Amino acid sequence: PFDLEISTLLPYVMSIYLVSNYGFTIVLLFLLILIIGFVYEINTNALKINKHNKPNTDSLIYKL
Amino acid sequence: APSWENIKDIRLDPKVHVDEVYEPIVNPADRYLQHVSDLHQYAKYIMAALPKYIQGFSVWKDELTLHVAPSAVIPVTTFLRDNTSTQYKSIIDITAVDYPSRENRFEVVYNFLSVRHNSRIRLKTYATEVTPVPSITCLYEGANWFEREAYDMYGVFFEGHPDLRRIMTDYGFEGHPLRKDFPLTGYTEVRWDEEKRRVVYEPLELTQAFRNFSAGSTAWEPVGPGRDDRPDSFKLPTPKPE
Amino acid sequence: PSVGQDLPPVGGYEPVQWRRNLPARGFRPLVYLAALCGICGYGFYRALGGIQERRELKREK
Amino acid sequence: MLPGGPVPVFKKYTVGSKGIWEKLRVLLAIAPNRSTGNPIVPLYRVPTPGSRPEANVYQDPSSYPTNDIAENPYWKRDHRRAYPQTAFFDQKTVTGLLELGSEATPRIADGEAGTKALANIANGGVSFTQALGKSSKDVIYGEVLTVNGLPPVAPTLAPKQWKIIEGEAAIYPKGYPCRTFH
Amino acid sequence: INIYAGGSAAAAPPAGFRIHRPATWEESEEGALSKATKYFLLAEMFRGLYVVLEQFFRAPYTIYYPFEKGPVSPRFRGEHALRRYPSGEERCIACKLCEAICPALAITIDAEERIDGSRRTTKYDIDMTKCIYCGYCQESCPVDAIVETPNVEYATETREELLYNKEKLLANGDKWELELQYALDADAPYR
Amino acid sequence: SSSLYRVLRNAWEVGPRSYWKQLNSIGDTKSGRLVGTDIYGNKFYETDHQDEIHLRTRYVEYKEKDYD
Amino acid sequence: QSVLVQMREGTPIGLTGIYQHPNPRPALIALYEATLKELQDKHPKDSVYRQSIENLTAHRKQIVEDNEVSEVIENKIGAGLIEEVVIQAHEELELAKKMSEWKPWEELEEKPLEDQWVYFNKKGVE
Amino acid sequence: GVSQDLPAGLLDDIYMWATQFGDRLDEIEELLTDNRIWKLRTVNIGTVTAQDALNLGLSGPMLRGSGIPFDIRKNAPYDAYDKVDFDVPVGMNGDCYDRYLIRMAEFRQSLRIIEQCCNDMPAGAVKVEDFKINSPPRNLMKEDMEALIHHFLLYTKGYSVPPGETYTAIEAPKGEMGVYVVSDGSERPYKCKIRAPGFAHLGAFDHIARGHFLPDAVAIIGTMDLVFGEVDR
Amino acid sequence: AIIATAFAETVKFSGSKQELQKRTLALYRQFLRGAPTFADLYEVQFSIPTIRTKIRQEFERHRFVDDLSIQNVLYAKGHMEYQECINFWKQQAQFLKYFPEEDDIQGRHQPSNFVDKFLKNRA
Ligand code: SF4
């Protein structure tokens, strides 16, 4: 999807003059909507590698 | 002005000139006497606290050895790990020594360090080829590899050990090398067989036989008896004559 | 005795450098940021000025 | 400065630059203090080890009380044969020190009476636990435990009292996660 | 002054052994934009690049070996040699101290009474493939017979060439006597 | 010193014959005074220039093409 | 009731894995009093083990009760930081509870054979 | 003691090396110390606690990175470390970055010690002056009868050590290296066990590297400083 | 902690022959079940029946031992060998130490009487 986004921006950069100040706003809306998904990707931490054997962080409590 | 080209040739500076070197004659053991008395008192306390376990103690030049039986390993080690005055928390070494003249041939030695008090202690037990010793991996995880090495080299079996297997020797090695009846060169050797296209284990043949040269050991006794360095607090009292 | 031994000098040696000698160097970072912003601003002034001239040449063509 | 740096280049025995190239190097260096570690050839390992003059005058070194030819018997400096014995204490020998006393604090009768009192311990007459139960307060508190009743600590031959170096005399500055202990 | 229970004056912690505390993002003596510039512009990384580049303009340390040799000392332990006197007679007297001290058992010696009544060897072999080049034999010899030259350039294609015998060792001494004399004149007072 | 002026200056000192011999043998251009010759025919040289580093002051010019 | 012996998160002291103990002195007093209870209940009066740890615990408990600051306790108790003294007390308590089931005061369980403990000193064997 | 005395002109050259070694250390630190990638590969990797560092038998930088100030040269000095001034680096956080910083501080303190020894090198003998333990000089072995007898015996039979046993240790650069020797009154040992510092560290690898990715195992093996002659002996 | 490997068994010395009986039979079962793995891992030039025959031979070697502790040691070493074989720690070279019979006939003259050994100086 991100590759298709960046490749769909090619028509814009080859049409940038003819679509003057209208297509500019349109592609900005495009980029914002596609930045929302990138925000989702970052906030979910989807490309993070998780570790099973955690280090123990719980206190040592002795029943008297 | 000043640079590496105009640098002081230190090879020509005058060197310290000394006419006569003076070094006093001192016994290296005299440095230890107070500490020796201290270790004696300390060992007396341990023997009085654990009379069920401590068979003896011995003291030589800032080294205290505690003499116990195999049944007494885990209790005494718990004491040496958890007691506040004896905080031996670091395992240093576990070893075995073959004394084939003894009925229990192997002597399993433990070395411990306290970084709290900056002191070392030793603990010794005994074993045979078939009678095991308790494993102290429950207390010191570092003992794992050491106990494995003791098994591999001497054959001492440590009961309670999670994975006791050879560590040093070849994967099908038959024998325990550091036994005194095991020869220096062992029983087998290896070559590459072109017929079988394999590394083959075969009996031993040396082009030059081993020459021991222990037959030239001195026939006269080299060093006499030592010097009694027990403190008077630990020598038994001579009764007054009358 | 001691005749031909390798011994030190009488005043010893001049001291050696064994402490850390990583000196702080460079302008403070905001100077580098200001230089970056000025470089890129001037480049934009130079480039966008060239886009307008290209547009007028296109008009001619 | 501190006692341990920094030090200029011209006090370092390394081959550097000369002329306009030193004026450039001290302009383009992260630390002009720093050296190019090529030893100065006139001074380093010259004269060669196989052409030193000190070999012809070198004689075997010594120290006075051991090189003396008159009042120096070997048996007065034979430290190997004056080695300390390894003391061994079984439970019998320590109940003797407890039931009876020591050569420093004797608590034994005189004559043959004390002799066979010792002999009753040399053989299994009185046990170690019996001797501990029979032992007074002043025996334990002073010959087993300390005078204050506390147990003795694991002794230290050379006690080392640590000190932390902070600030400017330290190895790393304040931010770094390694400290300096004297 | 103080009585200790399971402790010591040395085992007590130093004065500032408890580290102060970690520093938060507040209590920062460095603005956010400045450290962000150092973050985005890779300051320390360019500094490391420059420290590598400074070495590009410094003298290479490389010596061209077959044509320039490295540093050797009189004490150096290399190929072995049997020495002679200026008479031409061989120094060795078959005492077998080098055979005895050799940790690798590389020396093999046999001797008998020579025709002129002299104690001299009939066999002297060194397995270089056993030897560790320690110098204990050169230290043990009371006549300066066995020595180690400074030579290291004697590699072979066959291992049967490294089973040196008496004739090889004597020829090697006859070859290397001058180098050995330099080394001895430099080294003998120290041993 | 790893600079071009070094090789140019030395190749001006030692002529082009020595330059091509050294380029075919050592790979580097060195100018020094002849110290002596050995029984095999190898010539031995020593340099006095500040450019040459520690342990690059003495060198050999072998007689055999199959040097050793 | 339960005592906090070791905090494995939070503010780090110079040691790794040990972190700042909140309210250490109550934990120390609890552990010392429990140690004294276990000894006075399940150990003989004449045993040297009991006397040893009783006098030790009482000395340390007086240090902890009289003084309020942690640094002063760390200097008067000569064993590490107070977060380590808590762990020492805990280990001593567990050791007393283990030595209750064992019986160190008893006589020697396994006596050595005569051959054992002979090493190359007897003048006539080599 | 020592086999041979120092040759002439060695202290001057050691000082010449010491005048410049600090800049070499500094140039290495410029690449490694404050670097982002180095810190990523080293910060909070291979963490071991002080308690577990002791239980596993670790020493040296592995124990000093966890916070324990222990060094045998200061706690049980052996040769001359009681006659020379040096500081000990100790770190928190038990990571590989702290071990790296410890080792660089140890570089600098070793340089300090070398300076002091080059300035304060005494005169005299370099080996014991008892020819029943050490070889005599050659000019006495070739003129004195007792000297030659002692040479002969020391180089054929050897010196006989008293009976006993000792465990002694040093602060080797890898950690606490030790030798448990047993003597039977003979010229040959009855038993020699080497306590190699790498044996314990590679044994602790299982505890230290669990939960880590494979690129971090490389860093852990590198901070243990594992030579395998000592591991395997 | 330092955790054990795949097929590790804690060392536990039986105080009874009847329990060690079951332990030994289980180990025999495990060897027999793993023989196909021993033939696949080590590129073996012979049958799986041959591997099981060899296992049975090595288990029969110590069949009439009656000292309990010796049997305990033998069980422990057998489990060590099982862990070394099933986990591919050994190589073919060490695994084929057990199988000298499968390699081709070692020459012509293999003495079994006195005069042969005498002529070859083995009597
Ligand atoms: S120097 Fe070589 S030949 Fe001589 S004893 Fe040592 S190993 Fe053997």
Ligand code: SF4
């Ligand atoms: S070489 Fe020297 S030590 Fe060896 S046998 Fe000959 S004389 Fe003796």
